[PDB]
């Protein structure tokens, strides 16, 4: 069997790490966002003096930076922030290429396409929107849309499939088709509101979650409820793996890493105890992301740390 060892821990933030994403061009870097209004681009080592040091911190937003994502090129970076605006970075020193003006209220989620000409956004404006990489609005989606805030959107592999995922707090997952902008389907099956959704790199799956408590799985190819697992009280982040077919589930006190072939828990990551009264011993895990190797994964927590783990065989 395969199990997990606690690798190390990074330090650099004064606020809660909100999201992390990983450059596949360089596994040497890794990127993070946080609730102290900075995105930190790191310089990693595998050393014991540190596991990495912050190289720079890109600044400009007047509120927290919720989510962050890499470019296919890996020399650009894109952001969603609780100031209601987005910025399009030139990931070297700073120096914004473009800042995107739209959306009445916050930009919660953001993503950057394979084609590098389509950029989507989820907002509390209750709008999915499409964006030219000239920072102008290719289209805006506001009809047939959610009546509650749009929680997270995703780009799906465009192998021949023009589909993009959307999930809101209205207890629904809406799939939208590029350049027709219609509902492909509506999926129902979450008691709680949906936080997140993510698609497999292969492109056949949609791991969706919320405050349902159950982690339900949907099919990317036509929309079928594949199966369900009991686990993940509050689901904040999900991430498929490239080197295995796993799915890594972010609960507050713990991370539950699941093998799906067949359905079983591989391990549960627990942090070492700290004596508290009345009880404040768990810090919430909110994000997680695999490295390209798939040996190491990183996690974002609300204790202002990015905890590292590694798979051992």
């Amino acid at each position: 069997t395969e199990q997990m060892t606690l690798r190390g821990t990074l330090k650099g933030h004064n606020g809660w790490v909100t999201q992390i994403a990983t450059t596949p061009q360089f596994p040497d870097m890794i990127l993070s966002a946080s609730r102290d209004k900075t995105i930190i681009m790191w310089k990693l080592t595998r050393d014991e003096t540190n596991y990495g040091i912050p190289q720079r911190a890109l600044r400009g937003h007047s509120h927290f930076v919720s989510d962050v994502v890499i470019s296919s090129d890996g020399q650009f970076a894109l952001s969603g922030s609780w100031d209601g605006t987005l910025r399009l970075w030139d990931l070297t020193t700073g120096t914004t290429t473009r800042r995107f003006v739209g959306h009445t209220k916050d930009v919660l989620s953001v993503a950057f396409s394979s084609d590098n000409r389509q950029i989507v956004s989820g907002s509390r404006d209750k709008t999915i929107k499409l964006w030219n990489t000239l920072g102008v609005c290719k289209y805006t989606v506001q009809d047939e849309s959610h009546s509650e805030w749009v929680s997270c959107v995703r780009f799906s592999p465009n192998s021949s499939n023009p589909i993009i995922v959307s999930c809101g707090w209205d207890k629904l997952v809406k799939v939208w088709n590029l350049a027709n902008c219609k509902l492909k389907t509506n999926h129902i099956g979450h008691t709680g509101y949906l936080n997140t959704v993510t698609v497999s790199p292969d492109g056949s799956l949609c791991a969706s979650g919320g405050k349902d408590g159950q982690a339900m799985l949907w099919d990317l190819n036509e929309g079928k409820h594949l199966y369900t697992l009991d686990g993940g009280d509050i689901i904040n982040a999900l991430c498929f793996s490239p080197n295995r077919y796993w799915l890594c589930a972010a609960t507050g006190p713990s991370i539950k890493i699941w093998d799906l072939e067949g359905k079983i828990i591989v391990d549960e990551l627990k942090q070492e105890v700290i004596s508290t009264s009345s009880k404040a011993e768990p810090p919430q895990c909110t994000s997680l992301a695999w490295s390209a190797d798939g040996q190491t994964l990183f996690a974002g927590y609300t204790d202002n740390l990015v905890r590292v783990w590694q798979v051992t065989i």
């Binding site: 509902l183 389907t185 999926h187 129902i188 099956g189 979450h190 339900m216 409820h225």
Partner: protein
């Protein structure tokens, strides 16, 4: 305020009247209530969800 005369002395009138409009209508007056500023809260919160896919 109005002064009114009479054959013996003067009488002082004062009138103070409080306007009724607040959220709906004119719209003119702003939201803050007299001396306890109050929140008005709509209601709805249910679910009916069970596994289904509605393919369109």
């Amino acid at each position: 305020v109005r002064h009114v005369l009479l054959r013996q002395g003067v009488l002082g009138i004062k009138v103070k009247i409080m306007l009724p409009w607040d959220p709906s209508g004119k719209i003119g007056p702003k939201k803050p209530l007299p001396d306890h500023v109050s929140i008005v809260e709509p209601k709805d919160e249910i679910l009916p969800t069970t596994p289904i896919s509605e393919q369109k």
